[PDB]
Design an enzyme around this catalytic site. Structure first.
Site, PDB file in Angstrom:
ATOM      1  N   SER B  36       0.789  -1.244   0.000  1.00  0.00           N
ATOM      2  CA  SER B  36       0.000   0.000   0.000  1.00  0.00           C
ATOM      3  C   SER B  36       0.822   1.295   0.000  1.00  0.00           C
ATOM      4  O   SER B  36       0.327   2.330  -0.453  1.00  0.00           O
ATOM      5  CB  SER B  36      -0.974   0.017   1.183  1.00  0.00           C
ATOM      6  OG  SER B  36      -0.284  -0.127   2.407  1.00  0.00           O
ATOM      7  N   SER B  40       6.015   0.398   3.229  1.00  0.00           N
ATOM      8  CA  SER B  40       5.738  -1.032   3.432  1.00  0.00           C
ATOM      9  C   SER B  40       6.464  -1.904   2.417  1.00  0.00           C
ATOM     10  O   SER B  40       6.892  -3.004   2.748  1.00  0.00           O
ATOM     11  CB  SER B  40       4.229  -1.342   3.468  1.00  0.00           C
ATOM     12  OG  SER B  40       3.711  -1.703   2.192  1.00  0.00           O
ATOM     13  N   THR B  44       9.463  -4.847   3.027  1.00  0.00           N
ATOM     14  CA  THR B  44       9.544  -6.218   2.513  1.00  0.00           C
ATOM     15  C   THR B  44      10.897  -6.472   1.853  1.00  0.00           C
ATOM     16  O   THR B  44      11.503  -7.534   2.039  1.00  0.00           O
ATOM     17  CB  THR B  44       8.439  -6.553   1.483  1.00  0.00           C
ATOM     18  OG1 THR B  44       7.311  -5.695   1.661  1.00  0.00           O
ATOM     19  CG2 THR B  44       7.998  -7.992   1.640  1.00  0.00           C
ATOM     20  N   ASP B  61      -1.962   2.258  -3.140  1.00  0.00           N
ATOM     21  CA  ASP B  61      -2.941   2.375  -2.078  1.00  0.00           C
ATOM     22  C   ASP B  61      -4.326   2.086  -2.640  1.00  0.00           C
ATOM     23  O   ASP B  61      -4.872   2.871  -3.430  1.00  0.00           O
ATOM     24  CB  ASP B  61      -2.895   3.760  -1.455  1.00  0.00           C
ATOM     25  CG  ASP B  61      -3.804   3.881  -0.250  1.00  0.00           C
ATOM     26  OD1 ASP B  61      -4.694   3.017  -0.063  1.00  0.00           O
ATOM     27  OD2 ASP B  61      -3.628   4.843   0.522  1.00  0.00           O
ATOM     28  N   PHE B  62      -4.894   0.962  -2.218  1.00  0.00           N
ATOM     29  CA  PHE B  62      -6.190   0.529  -2.727  1.00  0.00           C
ATOM     30  C   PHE B  62      -7.384   1.342  -2.192  1.00  0.00           C
ATOM     31  O   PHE B  62      -8.486   1.278  -2.738  1.00  0.00           O
ATOM     32  CB  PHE B  62      -6.369  -0.978  -2.534  1.00  0.00           C
ATOM     33  CG  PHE B  62      -5.648  -1.818  -3.571  1.00  0.00           C
ATOM     34  CD1 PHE B  62      -5.201  -1.249  -4.776  1.00  0.00           C
ATOM     35  CD2 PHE B  62      -5.451  -3.180  -3.364  1.00  0.00           C
ATOM     36  CE1 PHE B  62      -4.570  -2.020  -5.752  1.00  0.00           C
ATOM     37  CE2 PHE B  62      -4.814  -3.965  -4.323  1.00  0.00           C
ATOM     38  CZ  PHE B  62      -4.370  -3.380  -5.531  1.00  0.00           C
ATOM     39  N   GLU B 121     -13.983  -4.615  12.492  1.00  0.00           N
ATOM     40  CA  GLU B 121     -14.221  -5.094  13.852  1.00  0.00           C
ATOM     41  C   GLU B 121     -15.313  -4.304  14.594  1.00  0.00           C
ATOM     42  O   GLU B 121     -15.347  -4.282  15.828  1.00  0.00           O
ATOM     43  CB  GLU B 121     -12.903  -5.199  14.657  1.00  0.00           C
ATOM     44  CG  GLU B 121     -12.111  -3.906  14.827  1.00  0.00           C
ATOM     45  CD  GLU B 121     -10.620  -4.152  15.016  1.00  0.00           C
ATOM     46  N   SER B 177     -11.009 -15.103  -1.207  1.00  0.00           N
ATOM     47  CA  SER B 177     -12.237 -15.031  -0.432  1.00  0.00           C
ATOM     48  C   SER B 177     -12.034 -15.639   0.954  1.00  0.00           C
ATOM     49  O   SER B 177     -10.977 -16.194   1.256  1.00  0.00           O
ATOM     50  CB  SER B 177     -13.374 -15.748  -1.160  1.00  0.00           C
ATOM     51  OG  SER B 177     -14.637 -15.327  -0.674  1.00  0.00           O
ATOM     52  N   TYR B 193     -17.131  -6.302   5.805  1.00  0.00           N
ATOM     53  CA  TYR B 193     -16.039  -7.223   5.478  1.00  0.00           C
ATOM     54  C   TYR B 193     -16.572  -8.458   4.768  1.00  0.00           C
ATOM     55  O   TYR B 193     -16.123  -8.785   3.671  1.00  0.00           O
ATOM     56  CB  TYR B 193     -15.260  -7.649   6.722  1.00  0.00           C
ATOM     57  CG  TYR B 193     -14.223  -8.725   6.457  1.00  0.00           C
ATOM     58  CD1 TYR B 193     -12.929  -8.387   6.043  1.00  0.00           C
ATOM     59  CD2 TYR B 193     -14.533 -10.088   6.621  1.00  0.00           C
ATOM     60  CE1 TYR B 193     -11.971  -9.371   5.806  1.00  0.00           C
ATOM     61  CE2 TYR B 193     -13.578 -11.087   6.368  1.00  0.00           C
ATOM     62  CZ  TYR B 193     -12.302 -10.716   5.969  1.00  0.00           C
ATOM     63  OH  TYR B 193     -11.357 -11.688   5.718  1.00  0.00           O
ATOM     64  N   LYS B 197     -16.234  -9.749   0.880  1.00  0.00           N
ATOM     65  CA  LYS B 197     -15.797 -11.105   0.538  1.00  0.00           C
ATOM     66  C   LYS B 197     -16.837 -11.875  -0.279  1.00  0.00           C
ATOM     67  O   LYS B 197     -16.473 -12.573  -1.241  1.00  0.00           O
ATOM     68  CB  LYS B 197     -15.358 -11.891   1.771  1.00  0.00           C
ATOM     69  CG  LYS B 197     -14.168 -11.292   2.481  1.00  0.00           C
ATOM     70  CD  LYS B 197     -13.006 -11.042   1.548  1.00  0.00           C
ATOM     71  CE  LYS B 197     -11.723 -10.855   2.343  1.00  0.00           C
ATOM     72  NZ  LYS B 197     -10.573 -10.482   1.461  1.00  0.00           N
ATOM     73  N   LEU B 225      -8.657 -18.701   9.342  1.00  0.00           N
ATOM     74  CA  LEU B 225      -8.065 -18.610  10.705  1.00  0.00           C
ATOM     75  C   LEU B 225      -6.636 -18.033  10.840  1.00  0.00           C
ATOM     76  O   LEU B 225      -5.885 -17.914   9.855  1.00  0.00           O
ATOM     77  CB  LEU B 225      -8.137 -19.957  11.437  1.00  0.00           C
TER      78      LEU B 225
HETATM   79  N1  LIG Z   1      -6.795 -13.389   9.023  1.00  0.00           N
HETATM   80  C1  LIG Z   1      -7.662 -14.516   8.707  1.00  0.00           C
HETATM   81  O1  LIG Z   1      -7.899 -15.333   9.589  1.00  0.00           O
HETATM   82  C2  LIG Z   1      -8.280 -14.677   7.301  1.00  0.00           C
HETATM   83  C3  LIG Z   1      -7.956 -13.803   6.253  1.00  0.00           C
HETATM   84  N2  LIG Z   1      -8.506 -13.929   5.012  1.00  0.00           N
HETATM   85  C4  LIG Z   1      -8.162 -12.989   3.887  1.00  0.00           C
HETATM   86  O2  LIG Z   1      -6.955 -13.286   3.269  1.00  0.00           O
HETATM   87  C5  LIG Z   1      -6.290 -12.054   2.939  1.00  0.00           C
HETATM   88  C6  LIG Z   1      -4.825 -11.933   3.518  1.00  0.00           C
HETATM   89  O3  LIG Z   1      -4.525 -11.061   4.597  1.00  0.00           O
HETATM   90  P1  LIG Z   1      -3.926 -11.631   5.981  1.00  0.00           P
HETATM   91  O4  LIG Z   1      -3.190 -12.951   5.681  1.00  0.00           O
HETATM   92  O5  LIG Z   1      -5.102 -11.926   6.920  1.00  0.00           O
HETATM   93  O6  LIG Z   1      -2.794 -10.725   6.649  1.00  0.00           O
HETATM   94  P2  LIG Z   1      -2.708  -9.150   6.666  1.00  0.00           P
HETATM   95  O7  LIG Z   1      -4.156  -8.645   6.872  1.00  0.00           O
HETATM   96  O8  LIG Z   1      -1.780  -8.736   7.873  1.00  0.00           O
HETATM   97  O9  LIG Z   1      -2.234  -8.588   5.286  1.00  0.00           O
HETATM   98  C7  LIG Z   1      -2.888  -7.475   4.698  1.00  0.00           C
HETATM   99  C8  LIG Z   1      -2.376  -7.050   3.320  1.00  0.00           C
HETATM  100  O10 LIG Z   1      -3.273  -6.192   2.740  1.00  0.00           O
HETATM  101  C9  LIG Z   1      -2.564  -5.062   2.235  1.00  0.00           C
HETATM  102  N3  LIG Z   1      -3.307  -3.799   2.314  1.00  0.00           N
HETATM  103  C10 LIG Z   1      -3.915  -3.295   3.407  1.00  0.00           C
HETATM  104  N4  LIG Z   1      -4.432  -2.090   3.088  1.00  0.00           N
HETATM  105  C11 LIG Z   1      -4.139  -1.814   1.794  1.00  0.00           C
HETATM  106  C12 LIG Z   1      -4.389  -0.745   0.912  1.00  0.00           C
HETATM  107  N5  LIG Z   1      -5.107   0.377   1.324  1.00  0.00           N
HETATM  108  N6  LIG Z   1      -3.932  -0.807  -0.349  1.00  0.00           N
HETATM  109  C13 LIG Z   1      -3.236  -1.869  -0.812  1.00  0.00           C
HETATM  110  N7  LIG Z   1      -2.989  -2.900   0.017  1.00  0.00           N
HETATM  111  C14 LIG Z   1      -3.418  -2.896   1.305  1.00  0.00           C
HETATM  112  C15 LIG Z   1      -1.409  -4.985   3.153  1.00  0.00           C
HETATM  113  O11 LIG Z   1      -0.369  -4.226   2.656  1.00  0.00           O
HETATM  114  P3  LIG Z   1       0.430  -3.273   3.626  1.00  0.00           P
HETATM  115  O12 LIG Z   1       1.518  -4.065   4.281  1.00  0.00           O
HETATM  116  O13 LIG Z   1       1.029  -2.136   2.832  1.00  0.00           O
HETATM  117  O14 LIG Z   1      -0.442  -2.708   4.715  1.00  0.00           O
HETATM  118  C16 LIG Z   1      -1.052  -6.342   3.413  1.00  0.00           C
HETATM  119  O15 LIG Z   1      -0.170  -6.866   2.473  1.00  0.00           O
HETATM  120  C17 LIG Z   1      -7.199 -10.968   3.263  1.00  0.00           C
HETATM  121  O16 LIG Z   1      -7.910 -10.631   2.125  1.00  0.00           O
HETATM  122  C18 LIG Z   1      -8.073 -11.528   4.250  1.00  0.00           C
HETATM  123  O17 LIG Z   1      -9.315 -10.867   4.303  1.00  0.00           O
HETATM  124  C19 LIG Z   1      -9.379 -14.925   4.756  1.00  0.00           C
HETATM  125  C20 LIG Z   1      -9.744 -15.830   5.754  1.00  0.00           C
HETATM  126  C21 LIG Z   1      -9.191 -15.702   7.036  1.00  0.00           C
END
Ligand SMILES: NC(=O)C1=CN([C@@H]2O[C@H](COP(=O)(O)OP(=O)(O)OC[C@H]3O[C@@H](n4cnc5c(N)ncnc54)[C@H](OP(=O)(O)O)[C@@H]3O)[C@@H](O)[C@H]2O)C=CC1
Ligand SMILES: NC(=O)C1=CN([C@@H]2O[C@H](COP(=O)(O)OP(=O)(O)OC[C@H]3O[C@@H](n4cnc5c(N)ncnc54)[C@H](OP(=O)(O)O)[C@@H]3O)[C@@H](O)[C@H]2O)C=CC1
EC number: 1.1.1.100
Lengths: 257, 257
Positions: B36, B40, B44, B61-62, B121, B177, B193, B197, B225
């Site tokens: 984003s 960040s 990485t 930035d999405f 949340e 998803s 949220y 999804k 999870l």
């Molecule tokens: N956590 C869980 O238990 C579950 C998650 N999921 C889904 O899987 C996906 C993976 O995320 P998760 O593994 O949970 O870990 P994270 O939520 O910690 O990772 C979030 C990612 O989203 C990016 N992001 C956030 N905001 C923006 C933005 N404004 N523009 C562009 N990119 C952005 C982040 O980039 P940046 O580092 O720059 O912020 C980061 O790479 C998500 O879509 C989530 O909804 C599905 C099932 C369960």
């Protein structure tokens, strides 16, 4: 005090939303109808019920989300059986209730129908960004805000007029989803339409889990017939239907029973 | 000519998207990662593969949807095993491929993972309009545009390098998803949220019907999870799980097999 239930029905200038509104009025509620323009609500404004029943229409363009949340006033019209339409300016969606209420009578919103809908007839890759923005703003973002504005209202009204419980239907939200939102009916040309319908359905299922313990009922209805044409004719022909009259009845069923 | 597959993985600066990327690199693809911010992706940029493998990161930035579609350039960084990060400015998402390609080698995108995700949340009625806008722009609107930009690219690449068929995986889109998108898991605090999804899942199912006859494969993965906490702890405890390593493997399974 006489408390008199009012329903807000978006997308009620024509189609399914018009059927739903006719039912509700037939069944004793006053109606606040939404359309997108001054012109479309003027068009609806041109049906004999109880003397205290009222109807009006408000113009809100759901494409202009989220700015329409902040408009100071809204153009509206009150209409009548046998008496010409009345130009109105309403400060909120609940302003018509305030104006109808009198020392003996209290009008209040107890039912919201999100029925306003924009369609899609193009392949994903051939659908522009603004088109996708319009579809989601009308079909999803705006309905969410309508739902939230109403729930705030409904909860506060419940606290201030506690007598309503046991002498009323529980405050009800009905969002109109589409058969396309899930399962077999994956129709080319409708990817963002269907997704917005998927979003509205799923939002409502989760909202119902939030709301049921707070005694607001949240339902979704999932109809599907009269598009086309949106590749696509091959599935739409291969695979049922819904009448606007049938949907109006189901909405009433959900509220009354 | 040697054609060398590249993957775009959004949300790959950490979490599941980081696992997915590590897998793909382990399995022989070059990676274009999205984050984003400039910060960040710098994070990485600080993993031994074949000499021709490449990795870079781009900052988009999405939340700034739909304006980011129109940026003239994007800040990016190319990073290395045993050699310091290289500041880059990329004209498009496919600009890194252009810069890697040489008289003998053609780098091209063949896989897009939409994994970027914003959480929720808060109760629906306690979630502001901009929060809902952020969630839908990151979780849905942006993934849709990414998917469309890539499909245009993938189709044009297929027409211009017809040899790729039978000597490659078919151009693949995988959208991430969540178990929350449907069924039993209706978790308070997550209404928008889950809807986003739901939208992404349903969009992809309809897209797959549009795309399968054009030989682009479109899949969704639905994990769940590690939230919490988002009323809500009562359901999340009452009712399975997913590992990022497990999801990375499933993504590879879908592409390779
Ligand atoms: N956590 C869980 O238990 C579950 C998650 N999921 C889904 O899987 C996906 C993976 O995320 P998760 O593994 O949970 O870990 P994270 O939520 O910690 O990772 C979030 C990612 O989203 C990016 N992001 C956030 N905001 C923006 C933005 N404004 N523009 C562009 N990119 C952005 C982040 O980039 P940046 O580092 O720059 O912020 C980061 O790479 C998500 O879509 C989530 O909804 C599905 C099932 C369960
Ligand atoms: N047609 C079908 O077979 C099916 C339809 N549905 C759904 O049921 C709903 C009912 O529509 P339908 O019966 O099909 O008939 P219509 O599509 O003809 O009615 C559309 C309504 O949406 C309103 N609307 C359109 N754009 C806006 C906007 N920018 N802002 C505010 N309101 C707007 C219209 O108001 P205005 O007059 O001002 O334009 C109108 O009242 C839709 O949500 C639809 O997706 C579900 C299953 C099947």
């Amino acid at each position: 005090m006489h408390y008199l239930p009012v329903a807000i029905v978006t997308g009620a200038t024509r189609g399914i939303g018009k059927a739903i509104c006719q039912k509700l009025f037939q069944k004793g509620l006053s109606c606040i109808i939404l359309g997108s323009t001054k012109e479309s609500i003027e068009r609806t404004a041109i049906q004999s019920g109880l003397s205290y029943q009222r109807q009006c229409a408000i113009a809100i363009d759901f494409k202009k989300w989220p700015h329409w949340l902040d408009y100071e006033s809204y153009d509206g019209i009150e209409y009548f059986k046998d008496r010409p339409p009345l130009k109105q300016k309403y400060s909120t969606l609940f302003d018509p209730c305030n104006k109808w209420s009198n020392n003996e009578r209290r009008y209040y919103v107890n039912l919201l129908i999100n029925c306003a809908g924009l369609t899609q007839e193009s392949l994903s890759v051939r659908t522009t960004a603004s088109q996708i923005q319009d579809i989601m703003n009308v079909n999803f973002m705006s309905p969410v805000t309508m739902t939230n504005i109403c729930i705030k209202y409904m909860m506060k009204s419940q606290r201030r007029w506690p007598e309503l419980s046991g002498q009323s239907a529980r405050p009800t939200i009905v969002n109109i989803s589409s058969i396309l939102h899930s399962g077999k009916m994956k129709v080319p040309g409708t990817s963002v339409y269907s997704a917005s319908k998927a979003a509205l359905s799923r939002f409502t299922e989760v909202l119902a889990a939030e709301m049921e313990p707070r005694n607001i009922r949240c339902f979704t209805i999932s109809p599907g017939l009269v598009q086309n044409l949106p590749a696509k004719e091959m599935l739409e022909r291969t695979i049922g239907t819904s009448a606007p009259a049938e949907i109006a009845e189901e909405v009433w069923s959900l509220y009354s029973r």
